[PDB]
A paper describes a structure:
Here we report seven high-resolution cryo-EM structures of filamentous peptide nanotubes based on a cross-α supramolecular architecture that provide insight into the designability of helical peptide filaments. A structural interaction is identified based on an appropriately placed pair of arginine residues (RxxxR) within the corresponding peptide sequences. This local interaction motif, designated as an arginine clasp, is robust within the context of these cross-α assemblies and can guide the coalescence of helical protofilaments into structurally defined cross-α nanotubes. In contrast to most structurally characterized filaments based on synthetic α-helical coiled-coils, the chain axes of the helical protomers are oriented in a plane nearly perpendicular to the long axis of the assembly.
Arginines were placed in an i,i + 3 (RxxR) arrangement within a heptad repeat located proximal to the N-terminus. The sequence at the axial interface was conserved in order to maintain the cross-α stacking interactions within a protofilament. The resultant peptide was designated as 29-20-2 using the same (x-y-z) nomenclature described above, with the value of z equal to 2 for the RxxR motif. The 29-20-2 peptide adopted an α-helical conformation in solution and. formed high aspect-ratio tubular filaments. However, the observed widths of the filaments were significantly larger, circa 12 nm, than the corresponding values for peptides in the (x-y-3) series. A 3.8-Å resolution helical reconstruction from the corresponding cryo-EM images afforded an atomic model for the 29-20-2 filament. Unexpectedly, the filament formed a double-walled cross-α nanotube that was similar in structure to that of the Form II filament and a structurally related mutant. Remarkably, the arginine residues in RxxR motif were not involved in the lateral interactions between cross-α helical protofilaments. Instead, cohesive interactions were mediated through hydrogen-bonding between the N- and C-terminal glutamine residues from helices on laterally adjacent protofilaments, as in the Form II-related structures. The structural analysis of the 29-20-2 filament provided evidence that the formation of the arginine clasp interaction required not only the presence of the two arginines, but also the correct orientation, RxxxR, of the corresponding residues within the sequences of the respective helical protomers. The relatively minor substitution of an RxxR motif for an RxxxR motifs drove the lateral association down an alternative pathway that resulted in formation of a double-walled nanotube in which lateral interactions occurred between terminal glutamine residues.
Numbering used by the authors:
A (entry chain tA), B (entry chain jA), C (entry chain ZA), D (entry chain PA), E (entry chain FA), F (entry chain 5), ...: 1101 to 1129
L (entry chain a), M (entry chain f), N (entry chain p), O (entry chain k), P (entry chain u), Q (entry chain 4), ...: 1001 to 1029
Y (entry chain 6), Z (entry chain w), AA (entry chain GA), AB (entry chain m), AC (entry chain QA), AD (entry chain c): 2001 to 2029
AE (entry chain O), AF (entry chain M), AG (entry chain K), AH (entry chain I), AI (entry chain G), AJ (entry chain E), ...: 1 to 29
AR (entry chain HA): 2101 to 2129
AS (entry chain XA), AT (entry chain NA), AU (entry chain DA), AV (entry chain 3), AW (entry chain t), AX (entry chain j), ...: 101 to 129
Write the structure that this text describes.
Amino acid sequence: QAEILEADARILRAYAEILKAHAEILKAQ
Amino acid sequence: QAEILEADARILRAYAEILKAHAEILKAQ
Amino acid sequence: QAEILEADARILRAYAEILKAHAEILKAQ
Amino acid sequence: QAEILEADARILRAYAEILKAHAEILKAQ
Amino acid sequence: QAEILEADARILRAYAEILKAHAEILKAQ
Amino acid sequence: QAEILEADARILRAYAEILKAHAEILKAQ
Amino acid sequence: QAEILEADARILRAYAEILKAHAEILKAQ
Amino acid sequence: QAEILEADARILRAYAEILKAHAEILKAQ
Amino acid sequence: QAEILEADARILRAYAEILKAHAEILKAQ
Amino acid sequence: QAEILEADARILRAYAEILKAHAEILKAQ
Amino acid sequence: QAEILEADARILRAYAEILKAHAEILKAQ
Amino acid sequence: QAEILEADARILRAYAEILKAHAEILKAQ
Amino acid sequence: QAEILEADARILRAYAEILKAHAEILKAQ
Amino acid sequence: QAEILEADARILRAYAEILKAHAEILKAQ
Amino acid sequence: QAEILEADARILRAYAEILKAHAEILKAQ
Amino acid sequence: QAEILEADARILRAYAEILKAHAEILKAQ
Amino acid sequence: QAEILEADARILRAYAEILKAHAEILKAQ
Amino acid sequence: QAEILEADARILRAYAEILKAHAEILKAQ
Amino acid sequence: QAEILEADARILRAYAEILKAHAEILKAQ
Amino acid sequence: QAEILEADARILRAYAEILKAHAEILKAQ
Amino acid sequence: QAEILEADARILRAYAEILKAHAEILKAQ
Amino acid sequence: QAEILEADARILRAYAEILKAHAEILKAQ
Amino acid sequence: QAEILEADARILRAYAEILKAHAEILKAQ
Amino acid sequence: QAEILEADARILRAYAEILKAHAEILKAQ
Amino acid sequence: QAEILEADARILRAYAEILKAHAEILKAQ
Amino acid sequence: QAEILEADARILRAYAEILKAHAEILKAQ
Amino acid sequence: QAEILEADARILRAYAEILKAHAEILKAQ
Amino acid sequence: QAEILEADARILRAYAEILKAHAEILKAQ
Amino acid sequence: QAEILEADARILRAYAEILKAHAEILKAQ
Amino acid sequence: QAEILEADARILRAYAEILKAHAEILKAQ
Amino acid sequence: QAEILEADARILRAYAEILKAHAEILKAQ
Amino acid sequence: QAEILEADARILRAYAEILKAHAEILKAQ
Amino acid sequence: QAEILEADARILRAYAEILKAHAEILKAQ
Amino acid sequence: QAEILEADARILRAYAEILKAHAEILKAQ
Amino acid sequence: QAEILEADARILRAYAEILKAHAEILKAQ
Amino acid sequence: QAEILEADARILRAYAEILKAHAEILKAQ
Amino acid sequence: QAEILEADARILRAYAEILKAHAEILKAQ
Amino acid sequence: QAEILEADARILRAYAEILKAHAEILKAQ
Amino acid sequence: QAEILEADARILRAYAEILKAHAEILKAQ
Amino acid sequence: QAEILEADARILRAYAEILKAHAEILKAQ
Amino acid sequence: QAEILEADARILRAYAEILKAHAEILKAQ
Amino acid sequence: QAEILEADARILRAYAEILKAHAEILKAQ
Amino acid sequence: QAEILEADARILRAYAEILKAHAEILKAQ
Amino acid sequence: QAEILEADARILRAYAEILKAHAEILKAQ
Amino acid sequence: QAEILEADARILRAYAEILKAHAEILKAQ
Amino acid sequence: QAEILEADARILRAYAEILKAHAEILKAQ
Amino acid sequence: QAEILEADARILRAYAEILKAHAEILKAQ
Amino acid sequence: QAEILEADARILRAYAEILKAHAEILKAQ
Amino acid sequence: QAEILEADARILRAYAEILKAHAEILKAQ
Amino acid sequence: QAEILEADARILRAYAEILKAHAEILKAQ
Amino acid sequence: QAEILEADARILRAYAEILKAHAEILKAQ
Amino acid sequence: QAEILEADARILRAYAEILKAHAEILKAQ
Amino acid sequence: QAEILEADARILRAYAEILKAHAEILKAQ
């Protein structure tokens, strides 16, 4: 099941990356 | 049933990959 | 009934493959 | 009734095969 | 009534065969 | 009434045979 | 009323025979 | 009224006979 | 009124006879 | 599971960054 | 887990900054 | 009593429907 | 009483329908 | 009373329909 | 009793439906 | 008893549906 | 018993649905 | 027993749903 | 036993849902 | 056993939900 | 075992919720 | 084990809540 | 372990509450 | 450890309460 | 007082209803 | 006062209804 | 007093209902 | 005041209705 | 006193109901 | 004021209706 | 102060209630 | 301040209620 | 601020209510 | 910001309501 | 962004409402 | 993106509404 | 993609609406 | 693919609408 | 395939619509 | 197959429409 | 088979339409 | 069989249409 | 049988149509 | 009002007399 | 905002004046 | 926004003036 | 956006001016 | 998008100017 | 797509200019 | 597809130019 | 199919050019 | 079938060329 | 049948060639 938890970690990292990009571009705004 | 769990892991990895690509391209945007 | 579960595993693997191909091509996009 | 379940297994295998072929050709696309 | 169930099994086998042929020819496509 | 059920079994067998022939000829196609 | 049910059985047998002949000739086709 | 039901039985037997003859001749076809 | 019902029985018997003769001659055909 | 906690830390850092950018721009307002 | 607590500290600092900016602008009002 | 004669009329109309459909058959041939 | 004679009229009209359909048959031949 | 004579008229019209249909028969022959 | 004769009428109308559909078949050929 | 004859009528109407659908098939070809 | 014949009618209607859907398929091609 | 035949009817209706959906697929292409 | 066949019917309806959704996909493209 | 097949049906319905949501995605784009 | 497959179904429904919410996002943009 | 997969489902539903709220944000802007 | 993943789910739901309240803020402005 | 993450969740819910009350303030103005 | 006159009107309408029903009777004869 | 005059109008309409029903009676004779 | 006149109106309407039902009887004969 | 004149108009229309029904009576004789 | 007259009206309505049900009986025959 | 004149018009139309019905009467004689 | 204005609104609504009840009186007369 | 403006709106709606009730009075006269 | 503008809208709608009620008055006269 | 524009739209619709009610006034005169 | 454009559309529709109401005014004069 | 284009279409339709209302004005003059 | 093309079609239809309304203007002058 | 071609057809019909409206303009001048 | 050919036919009809509208233009000049 | 030939016929009729519209153009010049 | 021959007839009529339209062209020149 | 011969007749009439249109062409030149 | 002979007559008339059109051709040259 | 009560008492007595006469007649029948 | 309250005072004074004049003239009545 | 409130004050003053003039002239009436 | 609010202020001032002029002239009336 | 808002401001200013001119001339009236 | 928005801005500016010119000339009127 | 959007931009620019020229000449008028 | 889209782009460019030339010459007018 | 699509592309290119030449010559006009 | 489609392709190519030549010569014009 550890694979499922790794997948969750990946999903959350990706979401954090989306949020960070949105933050940076909104700062550019 | 472990095969089902492996399939779930695969699905989530693929979704994470989609999200990562979308994040990178939105950063390129 | 294990055959049914194997069939489910196959279906999910195929769906994951579709998603992975779509992800790769969207990255190419 | 086990024959019915075998038939279901066959149907799902065939559907999985259709999906796999569609996935491969979409990757070729 | 078991004859009815056998008939159902036959019908589903035939449908699975149709689907398998369609899958193979679509792969040939 | 069992005669009615036998007739139903016959009908379904015949339909399955039609479907099997159509499947085989579509495979020949 | 059992005569009516016997008549129904006869009708369905005849229809099944028609279908079987059509199936065989379509296989010959 | 049983005479009416007997008449109905006769009608259906005759129709079944017509259908059987048509089936046999279509098989001869 | 039973006479009316007897007349109906007669009519249906006659119609069945017509149909039976037509069936036999079509079989002769 | 520590990976999950790291992901949470990342998410919260990103949210804090969004909030800080919004604060700075509202100060600019 | 200390990372989570640091993230909380960051969030609260950002909120305090928002509030301070709102206070200053309301004083300007 | 009127309802009884009404039912008789319905019987006769049904027989008329039989004959009319048979005529349509014979014309179609 | 009028309803009774009305029902009689309906009977006679039904018989007329019988005869008319029979005429249409004979014409079609 | 008028309704009663109306019903009588309907009876007679129905008989007229009988005769007219019979005439149409005889003409068709 | 009227209900019984009504049911008989329904039987006959159903047989008429059979014949009419068969005619439509034969026309379609 | 009327319910029994009603059920018979339903059987016959169902057979009519079978034949009519088969006709529609043959027309579509 | 009426319920049993009702169930038979349902079976036949279901078979009719099968045939009608198959016709719709063939038309769509 | 009626419940058993009802269940059979449900099976057949489900198969009809399969075929109808497949037809809708083929039309959409 | 009826419950078992009911469950089978549910399986088949679910497969129908799969196919119908796939059709809706293909139409949307 | 019926519960097991019920659970299988639930699995398949869930997969259908996946596909339907994906279709809605693709339409929204 | 049924509970295990039920849990799997819940997992899949949750993934469906993810996809549906993502679609709603994309529509809102 | 079922409880573990249930917990996983809860995790995924929570992530869905995150995404849905974010969508509501973006719509409100 | 299930309790740990439950706690994680609670964390994520709390973050969702944060985002939803922020959305409500932005709407109110 | 679960208690610790529970406490973290409580912290985050409290922050959510802060934001929600602030929104209610801003609406009231 | 308007209420009283309304009541009188209702009385008269009721008497009219009496006469109308009497006409119905007389016609039915 | 308009209410009173409306009530008078209703009285008169009721009397007219009486006369009309009386005409119905007289015609029916 | 209006209540009393209303009650009288109800009496008369009831008598009218009696006559109307009697007409129903007489017609049914 | 317009309401009062409307009421007068209604009175007159009612009287006209009286006369018209009287004409109906007289013609019926 | 209005209550008493209302009760009388109810008596009469009940008698009317008796007659109406009797008509139902007589028609059913 | 237009309402008042409309009411006058309605009065006059009502009087015209009176005269027209009177003409109907006189012709009927 | 908003409370005071709300109280004034309540006063006015109460006056409206008075006036409307007086209207209902005048209509009832 | 929005509360104050809402209170003003309530005042005006109450005045409207007064005026409309006065209208209903004047109509009723 | 949106709340303030909504309050203004409510003020204006209330004025419209006043004006429309005055219209209804003037019509009623 | 969309909320603000929606509020503006509401303002304008309210003005339209005012103007339309004034139209209805002027027509009523 | 689509929300913003929808808001603009609403603004324009509101202006159209204003203009159309002004038209209706001018016609009414 | 389709949503954005739909929004543009709505903008244009709103402009058309403006223009058509202006037409109706000019006609009314 | 079909959705995108449909959106384009809507754009063009909206332009047509604009142009036609302008035509109606020019005619009205 | 048929959907795509239908979309193209819609595009062309929209262009035709544009052109026809321009024709109507030019005629109106 | 018939669907595809129908789509082609629609394309051609749309082109015809374009051309005919252009004709109508040229005539109008 | 008849459907396919009908589709071909539609193609040809569409071409005829094109050609006829071109004729109408050339005449209009 | 008659359907197929009818389809052929339609093909030929369409060709005739083409040819006749070409004639009309050539005349128009 | 009459249907088949009618279809042949239609074929021949279509050929005649072709030939006559060719005649009209040749005349027009 | 008369139908068959009528069909033959139609065949011959169609041939006559062919021949006459050929005559008209030859005259036109 | 007691006069009204005596009147309806007379009415019911007369109706009872009619019923008794019809009863004695049907007894003589 | 005190100006709004003064306006309300004016409105209520004017309404009171209307009511006082109406009272005076109704006293004169 | 105070300008909007001043505008509302103006509107209400004007409406009060209209009402005062109407009151004065109704007193003159 | 303040420009929009100024425009609204202008619109309301203009409407107030229209109302004031109408009030003045109605006073002159 | 600010350009769109400026355009709206312009439109509303122009409409206000139209209204002001109409008010001025109606004052001149 | 910003080009489309600029085009819309242009259209609205032009419409505002038309309205301003119409306002100016109506002032000259 | 961006070419289509550029074409739309061109069309709207041209329409805006037409409108601007019409506005200029109407100002010259 | 991209060729079709390019063709549409060409058509729209040409139409825009026609419109631009017409605008230029109407400016020259 | 791609040949058909290429033919359509050719047709549309040719039509675009016609339109471009017409635009050029109308510019020369 | 592919031969028929090739023939259609040829026809459309030829028509496109005619149109291209006509466009070229109209450019020469």
